[PDB]
Amino acid sequence: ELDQTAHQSDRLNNALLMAIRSSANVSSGFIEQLGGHDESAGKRMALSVELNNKSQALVDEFVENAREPALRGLATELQATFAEYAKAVAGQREATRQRSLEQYFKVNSDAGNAMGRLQTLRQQLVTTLSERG
Amino acid sequence: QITELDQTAHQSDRLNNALLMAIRSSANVSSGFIEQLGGHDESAGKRMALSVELNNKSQALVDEFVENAREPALRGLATELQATFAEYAKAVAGQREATRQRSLEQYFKVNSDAGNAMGRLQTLRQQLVTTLSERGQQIMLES
Ligand SMILES: [Cl-]
């Protein structure tokens, strides 16, 4: 079950890295569109979508495998904060498709706040996994 | 052996936090540039401050990581990570300068320096995580 700890750590760390890369790509893509780099922006938008799908799958696996009573509530809190973040990054993508600076501003506050919480929740989970091992 | 095992985990954790804050740092510049272009200068300035904060915390973790990377199986990767992070931090600083100056043209080149260096940072993290985990397991197989 120590092998399970390593699999859980890989899922959590990769999910969060891919999730922030998804958002970074959509913001970069938006700036590319502003500069007229429209073929390059589309690559960024495709990578944002793909990174969202991959990171969501890893979060889902993480919560499927976080059965221990010490982790159950914290893993669901991670599931919920991650869903909040993913819905903000989907908002960033829609604002980019609409080329709307104001729509981007509205949703970006939600994205930054949910990512700040993901960083602190990750540390809580790392600590619980660490005592679990 | 529990000491060297707790050290191996701390190192992996420094690396993970450092890379997450580093990517966040660049994302905040990009999204701060979009906020500034939409007239939200106060939010954009907070994002520039957060970009600086995050990359300075990352830098401190990378430096501490290298200081604690003694084994030859690890210090070569670690000094590459530190050298690559230096390039990355400079490119993100260039992104912030381009934002404060409101220049798309300056932005685009450095976002590219930044993304290149970040691609390399990501691979080095993977290699270092695997190397740390191999050392932890080697200790275990000793026990
Ligand atoms: Cl953030």
Curated annotation (Swiss-Prot), chain B:
List the molecular function annotations (GO) for this entry.
Answer: transmembrane signaling receptor activity
The record's note on what follows loss of this gene reads: Disruption of the gene abolishes chemotaxis to benzoate, quinate, protocatechuate and shikimate. Inactivation of the gene does not alter competitive plant root colonization.
Locate the residues binding 3,4-dihydroxybenzoate.
24-31, 122
> Where on this chain does L-quinate bind?
24-31, 88, 95, 111
Periplasmic-side positions: 1-143
Biological process according to GO = chemotaxis; signal transduction
> Does the record carry Cell wall biogenesis/degradation as a key word?
no
According to the record, mutating residue 26 to A results in: Abolishes binding of quinate and protocatechuate, and shows reduced affinity for benzoate and salicylate
**Domain of life here?**
Bacteria
Summarize where benzoate binds, as residue positions: 24, 28
Per UniProt, the keywords (alphabetical) are: Cell inner membrane, Cell membrane, Chemotaxis, Membrane, Methylation, Transducer, Transmembrane, Transmembrane helix
Cysteines joined through disulfide linkages: none
What is the annotated localization of this protein?
A: Cell inner membrane
Q: Which residues bind salicylate?
A: 24, 28, 88
An example GO CC term for this entry is: plasma membrane
Q: What is the effect of changing residue 31 to A?
A: Does not significantly alter binding of benzoate and protocatechuate
Region span, Ligand-binding domain: 1-143
Q: How does it assemble?
A: Ligand free PcaY_PP-ligand-binding domain (LBD) is present in a monomer-dimer equilibrium. Only the dimeric LBD is able to bind ligands which in turn causes dimer stabilization.
Q: What family is it from?
A: Belongs to the methyl-accepting chemotaxis (MCP) protein family.
Q: What is known of its domains?
A: The ligand-binding domain (LBD) forms a four-helix bundle (4HB), and both ligand binding sites of the dimer are occupied with the high-affinity ligands protocatechuate and quinate, whereas the lower-affinity ligands benzoate and salicylate are present in only one site. Ligand binding causes rigid-body scissoring movements of both monomers of the dimer.
Name the job this protein performs: Chemotactic-signal transducers respond to changes in the concentration of attractants and repellents in the environment, transduce a signal from the outside to the inside of the cell, and facilitate sensory adaptation through the variation of the level of methylation. PcaY recognizes a wide range of compounds containing a C6-membered ring with a carboxylate group. Binds preferentially compounds that serve as carbon sources and among them those that rapidly promote growth.
Q: Name the chain's protein.
A: Methyl-accepting chemotaxis protein PcaY
Name its species: Pseudomonas putida (strain ATCC 47054 / DSM 6125 / CFBP 8728 / NCIMB 11950 / KT2440)
